[PDB]
Structure 1
Amino acid sequence: GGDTIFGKIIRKEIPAKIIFEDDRCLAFHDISPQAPTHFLVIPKKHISQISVAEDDDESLLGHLMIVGKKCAADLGLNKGYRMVVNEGSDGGQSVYHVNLHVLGGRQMHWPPG
């Protein structure tokens, strides 16, 4: 679903440790985890970044968050976690395919970067 490494993951062309899939999104462990649990939830629709998401995408974006919180519960994150979406250079976005980070299993600190 797109012209990035995450499109290749969606198409199963390169491996990832997949946590959950449905017809419109995919959740998988981050290859460079920043916490004991660190996974991504991505749409299969290639939205390059949250700044270009459309109004009609609202329920899809909320679906990523609902999938994210369900996966976090399944992975035992009962003490809490942090969800992150990066936009652009200042946001530290590393792949131009919208992706929701879910980090847990340790105390997350403030500020969030």
Structure 2
Amino acid sequence: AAPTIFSRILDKSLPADILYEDQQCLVFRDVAPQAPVHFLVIPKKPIPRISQAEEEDQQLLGHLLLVAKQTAKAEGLGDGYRLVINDGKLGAQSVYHLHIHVLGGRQLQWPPG
């Protein structure tokens, strides 16, 4: 039944560098950054993976992408960035709580893994 590590970031049990918070979501820096700017946008609702989002999540999912781009701008990513959502094993999903990676501050390569 126990929730993921992200539930303990959300309830502030685990210290994190939090960039933004509202009643729907939380934004915090990734502690294993893959770029000079690397942060995560997560819903408070513990959707485990994008494959398990439902129609009722439409507004929340749109809010997560708007918060990602608002936070990218606040972090100074004016020359481009990348949003990544990993689902399951082949996506290399680490924590089974929905998160959007935001990466910037270097040239991102193609393919994206």
What range describes the TM-score normalised by the shorter chain of this pair? over 0.9
Deviation (angstroms), 1:95: 0.2
In 2, distance between residues paired with 1:58 and 1:39? 22
In 1, distance between residues paired with 2:64 and 2:37? 17
In 2, distance between residues paired with 1:62 and 1:101? 15
Name the SS for the 1:16 alignment partner.
coil
Name the SS for the 1:63 alignment partner.
helix
In 2, distance between residues paired with 1:15 and 1:43? 18
Q: How does 1:94-109 map to 2 (within 5 A)?
A: 94-109=94-109
The one-letter code matched in structure 1 to 2:13 is E
Partner of 2:59: 59
TM-score between the two structures when normalised by the length of structure 1? 0.97
In 2, distance between residues paired with 1:70 and 1:95? 24
In 2, distance between residues paired with 1:48 and 1:40? 14
Q: Which runs of 4+ in 1 moved over 6 A?
A: none
Q: How does 1:1-113 map to 2 (within 5 A)?
A: 3-113=3-113
The one-letter code matched in structure 2 to 1:14 is L
The one-letter code matched in structure 2 to 1:22 is D
The one-letter code matched in structure 2 to 1:45 is K
Name the SS for the 2:89 alignment partner.
helix
Q: How many residues align structurally?
A: 112
RMSD (Å), alpha carbons: 0.8
Gaps of 5+ in 1: none
Identity of aligned residues (%): 58
